[PDB]
Scaffold this active site. Structure first.
Site, PDB file in Angstrom:
ATOM      1  N   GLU A  65      22.547  97.437  -2.174  1.00 42.07           N
ATOM      2  CA  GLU A  65      23.805  98.158  -2.039  1.00 42.07           C
ATOM      3  C   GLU A  65      23.686  99.232  -0.964  1.00 42.07           C
ATOM      4  O   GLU A  65      22.646  99.880  -0.821  1.00 42.07           O
ATOM      5  CB  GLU A  65      24.203  98.782  -3.379  1.00 42.07           C
ATOM      6  CG  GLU A  65      25.317  99.820  -3.301  1.00 42.07           C
ATOM      7  CD  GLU A  65      26.700  99.203  -3.151  1.00 42.07           C
ATOM      8  OE1 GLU A  65      26.801  97.964  -3.028  1.00 42.07           O
ATOM      9  OE2 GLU A  65      27.690  99.964  -3.154  1.00 42.07           O
ATOM     10  N   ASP A  93      22.703  94.660  -6.371  1.00 46.68           N
ATOM     11  CA  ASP A  93      22.463  96.017  -5.900  1.00 46.68           C
ATOM     12  C   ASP A  93      21.005  96.308  -5.584  1.00 46.68           C
ATOM     13  O   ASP A  93      20.731  97.069  -4.655  1.00 46.68           O
ATOM     14  CB  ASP A  93      22.955  97.035  -6.936  1.00 46.68           C
ATOM     15  CG  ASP A  93      24.424  96.872  -7.261  1.00 46.68           C
ATOM     16  OD1 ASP A  93      25.171  96.359  -6.402  1.00 46.68           O
ATOM     17  OD2 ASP A  93      24.833  97.256  -8.376  1.00 46.68           O
ATOM     18  N   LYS A 119      31.079  91.868 -16.405  1.00 47.55           N
ATOM     19  CA  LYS A 119      30.072  91.534 -15.407  1.00 47.55           C
ATOM     20  C   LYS A 119      29.251  90.311 -15.791  1.00 47.55           C
ATOM     21  O   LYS A 119      28.606  89.715 -14.921  1.00 47.55           O
ATOM     22  CB  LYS A 119      29.143  92.729 -15.174  1.00 47.55           C
TER      23      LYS A 119
END
Ligand SMILES: C[C@H](C[C@@H](C[C@H](C[C@@H](C[C@@H](CCN1CCCC1=O)N1CCCC1=O)N1CCCC1=O)N1CCCC1=O)N1CCCC1=O)N1CCCC1=O
Ligand SMILES: C[C@H](C[C@@H](C[C@H](C[C@@H](C[C@@H](CCN1CCCC1=O)N1CCCC1=O)N1CCCC1=O)N1CCCC1=O)N1CCCC1=O)N1CCCC1=O
Ligand SMILES: C[C@H](C[C@@H](C[C@H](C[C@@H](C[C@@H](CCN1CCCC1=O)N1CCCC1=O)N1CCCC1=O)N1CCCC1=O)N1CCCC1=O)N1CCCC1=O
Ligand SMILES: C[C@H](C[C@@H](C[C@H](C[C@@H](C[C@@H](CCN1CCCC1=O)N1CCCC1=O)N1CCCC1=O)N1CCCC1=O)N1CCCC1=O)N1CCCC1=O
Ligand SMILES: C[C@H](C[C@@H](C[C@H](C[C@@H](C[C@@H](CCN1CCCC1=O)N1CCCC1=O)N1CCCC1=O)N1CCCC1=O)N1CCCC1=O)N1CCCC1=O
Ligand SMILES: C[C@H](C[C@@H](C[C@H](C[C@@H](C[C@@H](CCN1CCCC1=O)N1CCCC1=O)N1CCCC1=O)N1CCCC1=O)N1CCCC1=O)N1CCCC1=O
Ligand SMILES: C[C@H](C[C@@H](C[C@H](C[C@@H](C[C@@H](CCN1CCCC1=O)N1CCCC1=O)N1CCCC1=O)N1CCCC1=O)N1CCCC1=O)N1CCCC1=O
Ligand SMILES: C[C@H](C[C@@H](C[C@H](C[C@@H](C[C@@H](CCN1CCCC1=O)N1CCCC1=O)N1CCCC1=O)N1CCCC1=O)N1CCCC1=O)N1CCCC1=O
Ligand SMILES: COc1cc(CCNC(=O)c2nc(-c3ccccc3)[nH]c(=O)c2O)ccc1O
Ligand SMILES: COc1cc(CCNC(=O)c2nc(-c3ccccc3)[nH]c(=O)c2O)ccc1O
Ligand SMILES: COc1cc(CCNC(=O)c2nc(-c3ccccc3)[nH]c(=O)c2O)ccc1O
Ligand SMILES: COc1cc(CCNC(=O)c2nc(-c3ccccc3)[nH]c(=O)c2O)ccc1O
Ligand SMILES: COc1cc(CCNC(=O)c2nc(-c3ccccc3)[nH]c(=O)c2O)ccc1O
Ligand SMILES: N[C@@H](CCC(=O)O)C(=O)O
Ligand SMILES: N[C@@H](CCC(=O)O)C(=O)O
Ligand SMILES: N[C@@H](CCC(=O)O)C(=O)O
Ligand SMILES: N[C@@H](CCC(=O)O)C(=O)O
Ligand SMILES: N[C@@H](CCC(=O)O)C(=O)O
Ligand SMILES: N[C@@H](CCC(=O)O)C(=O)O
Ligand SMILES: N[C@@H](CCC(=O)O)C(=O)O
Ligand SMILES: N[C@@H](CCC(=O)O)C(=O)O
Ligand SMILES: [Mn+2]
Ligand SMILES: [Mn+2]
Ligand SMILES: [Mn+2]
Ligand SMILES: [Mn+2]
Ligand SMILES: [Mn+2]
Ligand SMILES: [Mn+2]
Ligand SMILES: [Mn+2]
Ligand SMILES: [Mn+2]
Ligand SMILES: [Mn+2]
Ligand SMILES: [Mn+2]
Ligand SMILES: [Mn+2]
Ligand SMILES: [Mn+2]
Lengths: 179, 179, 179, 179, 179, 179, 179, 179
Positions: A65, A93, A119
């Site tokens: 990320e 990430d 998610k």
């Protein structure tokens, strides 16, 4: 144009995270001057990911990320082609060099376990680890494997609640929890 | 003069490694503006050696690569005259203070085990350790003793494959693998 | 993706001008990785404007180019509402505090006087000064009033021809002059 | 290897000029560890050229000495192709933007006017200005046009005599004046 | 050991002037921890000389005070052997490149004209200029030629009276004016 | 004045250790420009003490060498009055917070065990630890308790032999071993 | 507590001016978190005074505003006791070393000439110069002597109108003009 | 105004701790220029708290002392609302993330156990840990749980006795122990 949330975000997070969030949002066609709630959310997610990567031990995590899309992917292919892990469907990430798995970090305003569900249906990949943090102070991870120690994750929760207090002091938290 | 590989190398590695590679290549009568493949190879070797030395624990390694010939040797004599280890025939890259042996670091474009062979017939010294990395993502070391832990060596492989991707994206990788 | 012009632009100009050009081009929906000629043009225009503003004497110019659209305009309204000068129709590049007029800076690949024409039909405002530079080394300004002294404008021409040489050495200048 | 002049040069001039002199001498196949007198001469010439360029007024001089051969030339072509001045036969040291001429800076150990002669037969170009400095404290320029003011040129002479004193204090000046 | 004047001097002047005064006093066999009045005097003299040299225009003055004895002299011989000025008997503080003369800077606690007398009988050299400043706010120079403009010398007087006020506020000024 | 050893010492050690050695030698009435061998010895001792203190773990050692006499003592009284350890007769170099004892660090040019003897008759205090290093590469400590691990002490020996090589390359080592 | 004006002031001015305004307001018993309009006013006044002092020529102005009360006064006594100017009744903002007078700088939200009146009845000292700036873009000074040139004062007006625009964009300007 | 203790405090502690102590004392209506003993006490307490927080391991402590009242509290609510620990009645100094408790750090001039008593009657909260340090060199903590290791706490005691020596050398310690 002149929104309180914009000035609060520029006063709250450091300039680097603000610039990275501006870049990431302009890349996907979103204006930080208009989508101020999404601006604060991107800044918070970036800072949480950075504290998470710092919670390791030098050569522990690989930061995905905050990189550009073409660059952030290039590191994913390099990680997969060298370790043998299956390529994830969506950009994660982090990558845990100690656990041989990618990490997806979420920061939600609702309760901790509906965002994990949200998610989980999207991901459904393989060994991609999911770690969720909440502004209320709770957390939830895959297999109850929270990756980091208790002291590092407590800092993230403390900072998360600090931002929630500063938002409520400026009457901006109620609009933040809605969207 | 105007080669794509030169600009790519200047855009890929940090200025310090680029300057050190330029110095090391000019010292041996090789032009970075002409031998661009050797330029990229020297930069990659330097960066891999630096990540390797960083993978230790403070006082673990003594960096030999990147020093001037007369200076890089002077440290070898000082290491030998103080520990008692036999002096190597050719300049190594590191010295492991924990294992009492020199380390030779190779980065090849072919498969991992022919470059080790090529480096084994040349060396044939004594306790000089050989550690080989490849752009494909594999590795091979003496006695299967990989010196560093798994997390540090994974970073080197990931970065190596990142450079291979950026070269292929600019159609420069095919000419790199040839020479 | 992997274009020679991109790496050349990243190797030629300093990181600040590259970042500002990336921001300005992404703001208008143009990709520096694809519109590489426009990338080099934006970088060159930014550097020329910066050298121009530096050619003054401390409090001489107000830099308009390189600012965000909403911010770059806000300075134009502040300049107009305090001096009384009519507001320009399109965003200029500088404001001369000594001459009480805005300056439009152009850098063209054709001859010096067709770009001035092209910039004159578009403008047609009032006292907005036009200053044109060319890669061939010539220049042309409104009323033959070149604002700066000869020594400062010579540096801009020299640097402009330096970039033209580096482009031709990499066979990138011919494609640059076309678009 | 271990020469007093080498350590004196490394203790006398700043690291940047030492590195630039090392680069310029290795480029022409000369060893600073062996040609120590030429090392000191290159360092002194570089420092004198830098003080000369600093003696101007911001946008006055263009520094040619200290650049790489291919780069130092590229600026000469850009200066010639933009001003119209004839291209010099040999690499000069500066370009005076105020006088529209190149400057050749010499620092000799003999008397001031034989080195000018030596530099005049070699040059014989056109408007290329010649400016000579000596360790004795004298100077000589073309047409008695010393380009800079008296205060700047006095600093160069003072620093030149300071280096001569430090060399003689270490018994290194006598060997310096010979070669 | 624990003197108020020592802590006041360390709190008043910047660390560089304090270190230079300590060096200059230890060089002549004087202890800053014991000769605290002389410590403050050396710091004040150094700061006044530095403001004086800053009052020029880039290449105007050559700083002699604050250098080591062997080094501070070496610059005097270099200045004399290059300009032709007679060598002074005692170490001065500056050299005016615009006036071709050395400058002696004094800072006294008595009236302005007895210290000039005291400095005139000691000197009696030649063209060495004398410039005297006082804590009362007055000044006196040779031939009424005060070298600098009125604005620069006013800053020195203002700062001098600022130190006198801070000393009196701590009851340290009365002992300072005695010795 | 102009000694090869002075320039070599200024080229070998970093400016901080050189300044600290100059201060420590001027404090005891010794000139670095004259006692050049003692200058190199003080610089080497300071660097060895610094590497030793760095070989610990954050809060492990308290650096005594390199402080001013009045200050270096003040820390000794504070260490004694807080732990209860007897006050040493002569200034040591470090204090081991993990072993509750002071450390005396010696660097000799003779064999390792006569300097320990020389340092043992002088000390004869109590629990003050003695650690000796030699330019030959050997070492010797009290009770065979070498305090640090093998990897840290090997760096000190390697650096010590590096300085011995650079001295011999300049023909300065033979005069160093005598005094 | 959570006021939009506070975050806007922290986002608008640099951290140094914000800290100085916080100090100056806490010194007089005013809270920046509560008196947000006075906070913005103090920040604007400080920035205007700093731009004014920068508009000079090196040794031109002595900055009084931004210093602590006891310190800001100490410079006033030193200026008066060295030049002979009468001591002002109230703390000014600058001292013009070229005009031998103090300067009072005002920034009002009303028209330019009522604030000058308000500042004239309060002062009524002697040669203390008054210079007034307005957010509308106008200005007014004593004897029509505006001290600085036109280019420097235009920057102050432009920046003043820039702050007025940013306040109105956040609906904070209407409350600012009231108090 | 001119107190020896003020200059000693400004010479003893670093500028950051001095500024933080000035802020904390002005916040509660106390003048550092008048309450000089309280100034030294605040500086010492701040430095001790900082060394304590540094004695941990990266993510170990959360620094509460040195923050603004509204900010220092906001972190306390965030720590309580995320861990579940009861909110303390008075502001503590740290929070141990490893022990799930707040820490109160005291530095007294009397014996170690009366200040703990004084701090125990005031607190009487719950799991808030109390750690007391003394200038004599002793210490006392809750349940004999001294939180940190012996090496870190020894540094605090050593530094505490160093300040006591410097105060007594300036005859300021006797007045410090009284109040
Ligand atoms: C340099 C950057 C590396 C990291 C940047 C990331 C952010 C870090 C900010 C730093 C400064 N610190 C560390 C101490 C405090 C501080 O302020 N923060 C901000 C929030 C908390 C934190 O730890 N971190 C974390 C480890 C150290 C570091 O710097 N990032 C940014 C995205 C990609 C990436 O790898 N890089 C590397 C090359 C490209 C680039 O941008
Ligand atoms: C200073 C140098 C010491 C090392 C330099 C080497 C390179 C390092 C760059 C540094 C900055 N870092 C570290 C964090 C990120 C970064 O950018 N890099 C570049 C690639 C990865 C890396 O770790 N490293 C490694 C340890 C720290 C350091 O600095 N080198 C260079 C050759 C000889 C040597 O010892 N020295 C010492 C004196 C002479 C000299 O040049
Ligand atoms: C700081 C910035 C002010 C200017 C930046 C501009 C660019 C300058 C780069 C600087 C560094 N230098 C100056 C010496 C060499 C160098 O490398 N360059 C690059 C090309 C030539 C040049 O002169 N200049 C020019 C004057 C000094 C300065 O810094 N800019 C950028 C856009 C808006 C603006 O005003 N600011 C102010 C606040 C916002 C911001 O970004
Ligand atoms: C940055 C460089 C520009 C110049 C460098 C040159 C050297 C200068 C050193 C500087 C630092 N200063 C200036 C104050 C004191 C000091 O120590 N010195 C050393 C001797 C005296 C002097 O003035 N100068 C002179 C003007 C300012 C500057 O920096 N050079 C080096 C060769 C090519 C060039 O243009 N650049 C630009 C891009 C590439 C590069 O290397
Ligand atoms: C660098 C040094 C050059 C000068 C140092 C002298 C002191 C200067 C301090 C500087 C920083 N500034 C300037 C802005 C504010 C500030 O704080 N101060 C302190 C008091 C007022 C002042 O102007 N000045 C003056 C011009 C710039 C400079 O730096 N000195 C010191 C003695 C010999 C010498 O030439 N050098 C050169 C090589 C050796 C060395 O030590
Ligand atoms: C800052 C200083 C603390 C130490 C200084 C000492 C020297 C250190 C130099 C540093 C920079 N490093 C560390 C990385 C490489 C480098 O170049 N070196 C030089 C030789 C090897 C080394 O490690 N060290 C060691 C630990 C870190 C540090 O800085 N010293 C100096 C004497 C007293 C003291 O405590 N202090 C503290 C306040 C007063 C002062 O001077
Ligand atoms: C250092 C300080 C001196 C001045 C500070 C003042 C503020 C200046 C900020 C500087 C940085 N710059 C200058 C370039 C851009 C920038 O950001 N700004 C901010 C607004 C515009 C401006 O010019 N200025 C002006 C001249 C240079 C300088 O630094 N001040 C502050 C109050 C007292 C004082 O004299 N000092 C001296 C010792 C004590 C102290 O605090
Ligand atoms: C940056 C600051 C973080 C800490 C500051 C605190 C002080 C530290 C000073 C630092 C520099 N060091 C560390 C090495 C030596 C040194 O001089 N000192 C001074 C005394 C001893 C010490 O360790 N420490 C401790 C850990 C590192 C650090 O910086 N503080 C200050 C109050 C709140 C806080 O968290 N922050 C964070 C954001 C706001 C702020 O002010
Ligand atoms: C369009 O949105 C963005 C998308 C991206 C691409 C990758 N995305 C993430 O990595 C991510 N992003 C959010 C999140 C949620 C709400 C608002 C903003 C961000 N949450 C997460 O858990 C998370 O893994 C980067 C930045 C963005 O702004
Ligand atoms: C002439 O070549 C060089 C030689 C040297 C001397 C020491 N050499 C190495 O240390 C080394 N060098 C390469 C390598 C292989 C191909 C191209 C470039 C470098 N590979 C390795 O494994 C390796 O240990 C330094 C830099 C050079 O450029
Ligand atoms: C006069 O000499 C000095 C004395 C001092 C005081 C404390 N002294 C040491 O700490 C020390 N000093 C040397 C040593 C030996 C030979 C030459 C120079 C230094 N050796 C050691 O083992 C050692 O502990 C400090 C610096 C000096 O220069
Ligand atoms: C209590 O107020 C303050 C007073 C002071 C003391 C000196 N004062 C000024 O120098 C000043 N102050 C304002 C002004 C006007 C409105 C609000 C805030 C400041 N205007 C001016 O023209 C001006 O010369 C310093 C900071 C303050 O906040
Ligand atoms: C009014 O006083 C202050 C109060 C505060 C609020 C929080 N207070 C502490 O955190 C604290 N303060 C002292 C102490 C004792 C004597 C003098 C100064 C400070 N001792 C301690 O153990 C301690 O925990 C902050 C700074 C202050 O100056
Ligand atoms: N409306 C948002 C709520 C989730 C969140 O704020 O975290 C989505 O879904
Ligand atoms: N031709 C090269 C191939 C080896 C490599 O690229 O690593 C040699 O041999
Ligand atoms: N096709 C471009 C040419 C102009 C330029 O390159 O400057 C437009 O029109
Ligand atoms: N032998 C050298 C002397 C010239 C010089 O030293 O400047 C040539 O010719
Ligand atoms: N007693 C000192 C007084 C001079 C001074 O203080 O300036 C000498 O003579
Ligand atoms: N003459 C010196 C020799 C010891 C040494 O060099 O270490 C003493 O004794
Ligand atoms: N009420 C304020 C108005 C003045 C101003 O805002 O400048 C006073 O009087
Ligand atoms: N009088 C002070 C003494 C305590 C201390 O100095 O620590 C209170 O009570
Ligand atoms: Mn993501
Ligand atoms: Mn995520
Ligand atoms: Mn090698
Ligand atoms: Mn190798
Ligand atoms: Mn333009
Ligand atoms: Mn020349
Ligand atoms: Mn003097
Ligand atoms: Mn010692
Ligand atoms: Mn010792
Ligand atoms: Mn004012
Ligand atoms: Mn507290
Ligand atoms: Mn406390």
């Amino acid at each position: 144009r002149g929104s309180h949330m914009e000035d609060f975000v520029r006063q709250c997070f450091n300039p680097m995270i603000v610039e990275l969030a501006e870049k990431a949002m302009k890349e996907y066609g979103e204006d930080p001057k208009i989508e101020t709630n999404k601006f604060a959310a991107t800044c918070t997610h970036l800072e949480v990911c950075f504290m998470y990567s710092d919670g390791g031990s030098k050569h522990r995590f690989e930061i995905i990320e905050g990189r550009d899309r073409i660059m952030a992917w290039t590191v994913v292919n390099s990680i997969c082609n060298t370790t043998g892990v299956e390529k994830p469907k969506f950009l994660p990430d982090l990558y845990d060099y100690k656990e041989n798995r990618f990490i997806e970090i979420g920061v939600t305003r609702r309760e901790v376990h509906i965002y994990y569900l949200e998610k989980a249906n999207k991901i459904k990949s393989e060994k991609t680890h999911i770690h969720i943090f909440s502004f209320t102070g709770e957390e939830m991870a895959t297999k109850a494997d929270y990756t980091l120690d208790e002291e590092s994750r407590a800092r993230i929760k403390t900072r998360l609640f600090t931002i929630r207090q500063e938002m409520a002091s400026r009457s901006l938290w109620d609009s933040f929890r809605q969207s």
